[PDB]
Design an enzyme around this catalytic site. Sequence first.
Site, PDB file in Angstrom:
ATOM      1  N   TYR A  45     -13.753   8.236  -4.299  1.00 28.42           N
ATOM      2  CA  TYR A  45     -14.557   7.708  -3.208  1.00 28.42           C
ATOM      3  C   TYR A  45     -14.160   8.406  -1.911  1.00 28.42           C
ATOM      4  O   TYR A  45     -13.047   8.905  -1.773  1.00 28.42           O
ATOM      5  CB  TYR A  45     -14.449   6.188  -3.014  1.00 28.42           C
ATOM      6  CG  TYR A  45     -13.183   5.732  -2.295  1.00 28.42           C
ATOM      7  CD1 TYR A  45     -12.007   5.451  -2.994  1.00 28.42           C
ATOM      8  CD2 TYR A  45     -13.153   5.586  -0.907  1.00 28.42           C
ATOM      9  CE1 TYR A  45     -10.837   5.092  -2.327  1.00 28.42           C
ATOM     10  CE2 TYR A  45     -11.991   5.241  -0.245  1.00 28.42           C
ATOM     11  CZ  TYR A  45     -10.822   4.991  -0.950  1.00 28.42           C
ATOM     12  OH  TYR A  45      -9.709   4.649  -0.232  1.00 28.42           O
ATOM     13  N   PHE A  55     -12.358   7.339   8.574  1.00 25.16           N
ATOM     14  CA  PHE A  55     -12.792   8.057   7.370  1.00 25.16           C
ATOM     15  C   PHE A  55     -11.664   8.098   6.358  1.00 25.16           C
ATOM     16  O   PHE A  55     -10.522   8.134   6.760  1.00 25.16           O
ATOM     17  CB  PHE A  55     -12.961   9.573   7.371  1.00 25.16           C
ATOM     18  CG  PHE A  55     -13.911   9.977   8.481  1.00 25.16           C
ATOM     19  CD1 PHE A  55     -13.523   9.873   9.824  1.00 25.16           C
ATOM     20  CD2 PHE A  55     -15.193  10.453   8.186  1.00 25.16           C
ATOM     21  CE1 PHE A  55     -14.389  10.253  10.847  1.00 25.16           C
ATOM     22  CE2 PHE A  55     -16.057  10.821   9.216  1.00 25.16           C
ATOM     23  CZ  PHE A  55     -15.655  10.720  10.542  1.00 25.16           C
ATOM     24  N   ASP A  56     -11.953   8.086   5.060  1.00 25.64           N
ATOM     25  CA  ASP A  56     -10.904   7.758   4.103  1.00 25.64           C
ATOM     26  C   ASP A  56     -11.330   8.190   2.719  1.00 25.64           C
ATOM     27  O   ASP A  56     -12.419   7.845   2.287  1.00 25.64           O
ATOM     28  CB  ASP A  56     -10.623   6.258   4.014  1.00 25.64           C
ATOM     29  CG  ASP A  56      -9.683   5.797   2.911  1.00 25.64           C
ATOM     30  OD1 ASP A  56      -8.581   6.319   2.854  1.00 25.64           O
ATOM     31  OD2 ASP A  56     -10.096   5.017   2.039  1.00 25.64           O
ATOM     32  N   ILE A  75     -13.089  -5.103  -1.775  1.00 25.74           N
ATOM     33  CA  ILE A  75     -14.068  -5.898  -1.051  1.00 25.74           C
ATOM     34  C   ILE A  75     -15.201  -6.321  -2.003  1.00 25.74           C
ATOM     35  O   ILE A  75     -15.460  -5.576  -2.926  1.00 25.74           O
ATOM     36  CB  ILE A  75     -14.616  -5.145   0.194  1.00 25.74           C
ATOM     37  CG1 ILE A  75     -15.116  -3.749  -0.164  1.00 25.74           C
ATOM     38  CG2 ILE A  75     -13.601  -5.138   1.342  1.00 25.74           C
ATOM     39  CD1 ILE A  75     -15.835  -3.023   0.946  1.00 25.74           C
ATOM     40  N   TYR A 101     -15.049  -6.922   5.512  1.00 24.19           N
ATOM     41  CA  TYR A 101     -13.872  -7.580   6.120  1.00 24.19           C
ATOM     42  C   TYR A 101     -14.252  -8.695   7.098  1.00 24.19           C
ATOM     43  O   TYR A 101     -13.365  -9.309   7.715  1.00 24.19           O
ATOM     44  CB  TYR A 101     -13.064  -6.474   6.777  1.00 24.19           C
ATOM     45  CG  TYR A 101     -12.487  -5.531   5.738  1.00 24.19           C
ATOM     46  CD1 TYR A 101     -11.405  -5.908   4.943  1.00 24.19           C
ATOM     47  CD2 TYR A 101     -13.075  -4.297   5.508  1.00 24.19           C
ATOM     48  CE1 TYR A 101     -10.914  -5.061   3.960  1.00 24.19           C
ATOM     49  CE2 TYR A 101     -12.591  -3.433   4.543  1.00 24.19           C
ATOM     50  CZ  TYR A 101     -11.515  -3.823   3.768  1.00 24.19           C
ATOM     51  OH  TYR A 101     -11.063  -2.914   2.867  1.00 24.19           O
ATOM     52  N   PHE A 118     -19.757   4.012   1.903  1.00 25.09           N
ATOM     53  CA  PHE A 118     -19.015   4.767   0.897  1.00 25.09           C
ATOM     54  C   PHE A 118     -19.908   5.686   0.066  1.00 25.09           C
ATOM     55  O   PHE A 118     -21.036   5.354  -0.311  1.00 25.09           O
ATOM     56  CB  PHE A 118     -18.305   3.880  -0.127  1.00 25.09           C
ATOM     57  CG  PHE A 118     -17.271   2.952   0.503  1.00 25.09           C
ATOM     58  CD1 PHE A 118     -17.654   1.776   1.141  1.00 25.09           C
ATOM     59  CD2 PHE A 118     -15.926   3.280   0.455  1.00 25.09           C
ATOM     60  CE1 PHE A 118     -16.693   0.922   1.685  1.00 25.09           C
ATOM     61  CE2 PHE A 118     -14.974   2.425   0.996  1.00 25.09           C
ATOM     62  CZ  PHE A 118     -15.360   1.250   1.607  1.00 25.09           C
TER      63      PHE A 118
HETATM   64  C1  LIG Z   1      -8.119  -2.513   5.170  1.00 25.25           C
HETATM   65  O1  LIG Z   1      -7.219  -1.732   4.394  1.00 25.25           O
HETATM   66  C2  LIG Z   1      -7.680  -0.568   3.855  1.00 25.25           C
HETATM   67  C3  LIG Z   1      -9.019  -0.205   3.722  1.00 25.25           C
HETATM   68  C4  LIG Z   1      -9.368   0.993   3.095  1.00 25.25           C
HETATM   69  C5  LIG Z   1      -8.352   1.818   2.635  1.00 25.25           C
HETATM   70  C6  LIG Z   1      -7.030   1.425   2.697  1.00 25.25           C
HETATM   71  O2  LIG Z   1      -5.998   2.173   2.201  1.00 25.25           O
HETATM   72  C7  LIG Z   1      -6.298   3.102   1.155  1.00 25.25           C
HETATM   73  C8  LIG Z   1      -6.674   0.236   3.335  1.00 25.25           C
HETATM   74  O3  LIG Z   1      -5.369  -0.255   3.424  1.00 25.25           O
HETATM   75  C9  LIG Z   1      -4.841  -0.634   2.140  1.00 25.25           C
HETATM   76  C10 LIG Z   1      -5.532  -1.847   1.571  1.00 25.25           C
HETATM   77  O4  LIG Z   1      -6.799  -1.652   0.917  1.00 25.25           O
HETATM   78  C11 LIG Z   1      -7.804  -2.634   1.229  1.00 25.25           C
HETATM   79  C12 LIG Z   1      -8.806  -2.802   0.089  1.00 25.25           C
HETATM   80  C13 LIG Z   1      -8.257  -2.721  -1.330  1.00 25.25           C
HETATM   81  O5  LIG Z   1      -9.775  -1.723   0.223  1.00 25.25           O
HETATM   82  C14 LIG Z   1     -11.020  -1.974  -0.218  1.00 25.25           C
HETATM   83  O6  LIG Z   1     -11.334  -3.001  -0.754  1.00 25.25           O
HETATM   84  C15 LIG Z   1     -12.021  -0.891   0.178  1.00 25.25           C
HETATM   85  C16 LIG Z   1     -12.779  -0.357  -1.038  1.00 25.25           C
HETATM   86  C17 LIG Z   1     -11.856   0.342  -2.019  1.00 25.25           C
HETATM   87  C18 LIG Z   1     -11.189   1.529  -1.352  1.00 25.25           C
HETATM   88  C19 LIG Z   1     -10.549   1.167   0.047  1.00 25.25           C
HETATM   89  N1  LIG Z   1     -11.412   0.235   0.905  1.00 25.25           N
HETATM   90  C20 LIG Z   1     -11.544   0.340   2.252  1.00 25.25           C
HETATM   91  O7  LIG Z   1     -12.139  -0.530   2.904  1.00 25.25           O
HETATM   92  C21 LIG Z   1     -10.814   1.459   3.001  1.00 25.25           C
HETATM   93  C22 LIG Z   1     -11.521   1.733   4.355  1.00 25.25           C
HETATM   94  C23 LIG Z   1     -10.669   2.592   5.309  1.00 25.25           C
HETATM   95  C24 LIG Z   1     -11.408   3.012   6.599  1.00 25.25           C
HETATM   96  C25 LIG Z   1     -12.809   3.562   6.366  1.00 25.25           C
HETATM   97  C26 LIG Z   1     -13.599   2.585   5.539  1.00 25.25           C
HETATM   98  C27 LIG Z   1     -12.908   2.347   4.191  1.00 25.25           C
END
Ligand SMILES: COc1cc2cc(OC)c1OCCOC[C@H](C)OC(=O)[C@@H]1CCCCN1C(=O)[C@H]2C1CCCCC1
Length: 128
Positions: A45, A55-56, A75, A101, A118
């Site tokens: 992803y 961005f991630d 999520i 969130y 995403f």
């Molecule tokens: C809010 O915290 C994070 C969010 C995301 C990345 C993070 O680190 C890799 C992160 O901190 C670690 C915890 O993870 C949270 C959950 C598991 O994340 C998801 O549900 C979703 C979907 C699965 C992949 C990660 N997702 C995110 O929301 C990213 C997010 C980062 C900023 C840009 C929008 C995506």
Amino acid sequence: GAPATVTEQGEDITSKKDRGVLKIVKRVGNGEETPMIGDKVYVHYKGKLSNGKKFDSSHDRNEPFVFSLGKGQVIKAWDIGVATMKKGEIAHLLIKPEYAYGSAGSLPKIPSNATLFFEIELLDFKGE
Ligand SMILES: COc1cc2cc(OC)c1OCCOC[C@H](C)OC(=O)[C@@H]1CCCCN1C(=O)[C@H]2C1CCCCC1
């Protein structure tokens, strides 16, 4: 670009039909089984705030992202969206705060009331 295209043309995959999760298939997957709740799933992803401002990517860890579907380890939009995908599929998701969130957000990474985008590739899923 991609977020607006999803707004205009995405399919609403919510039960409520509140447009909380919009999808476009970018590349078609193989066969017709989608994962069942409880399946261990494997994705790559790329994500960001709809704003474009953070961005991630899974590629940043240099390994696929693994979780168990519909056990809320991700999520709600992912539990929803990924459930709709076939193996090898790529999809665009645009997500309102209510399926991410929420108004609480998740600082410092995610502000209050954030819309997320995403691109997801579903690599594989196994019946844990
Ligand atoms: C809010 O915290 C994070 C969010 C995301 C990345 C993070 O680190 C890799 C992160 O901190 C670690 C915890 O993870 C949270 C959950 C598991 O994340 C998801 O549900 C979703 C979907 C699965 C992949 C990660 N997702 C995110 O929301 C990213 C997010 C980062 C900023 C840009 C929008 C995506």
